[PDB]
Amino acid sequence: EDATNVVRGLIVELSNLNRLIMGTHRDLEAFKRLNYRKT
Amino acid sequence: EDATNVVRGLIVELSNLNRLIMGTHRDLEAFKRLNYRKT
């Protein structure tokens, strides 16, 4: 009946994905920035 | 107390994102495929 452990598992999974999304976002902003410097 | 409408909202949001993820995946596999043909 208490599904806390399942929901907390989903929070951990989604928060890990969100951390990865923001790191990818910052890496893409950085990559675009470096190409303007190269070109 | 009944949080069905909230959870179903999350299912709709995540399933929309999953549809977008698989479409992006197929578009990336297609893009890589076309570059082998061009080169």
Binding site: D2, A3, T4, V7, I11, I21, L28 | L10, T24
Partner: peptide, 30 residues
């Protein structure tokens, strides 16, 4: 069949879902 969930945890899960919804599309669409 119903299960019990902490309101604060469902609010947190909602926050995580809304964050992927807000930032993932711009990356995937270029």
């Amino acid at each position: 069949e119903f299960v019990k969930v902490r309101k604060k945890d469902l609010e947190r899960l909602t926050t995580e879902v809304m964050q992927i919804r807000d930032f993932l599309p711009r990356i995937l669409n270029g």
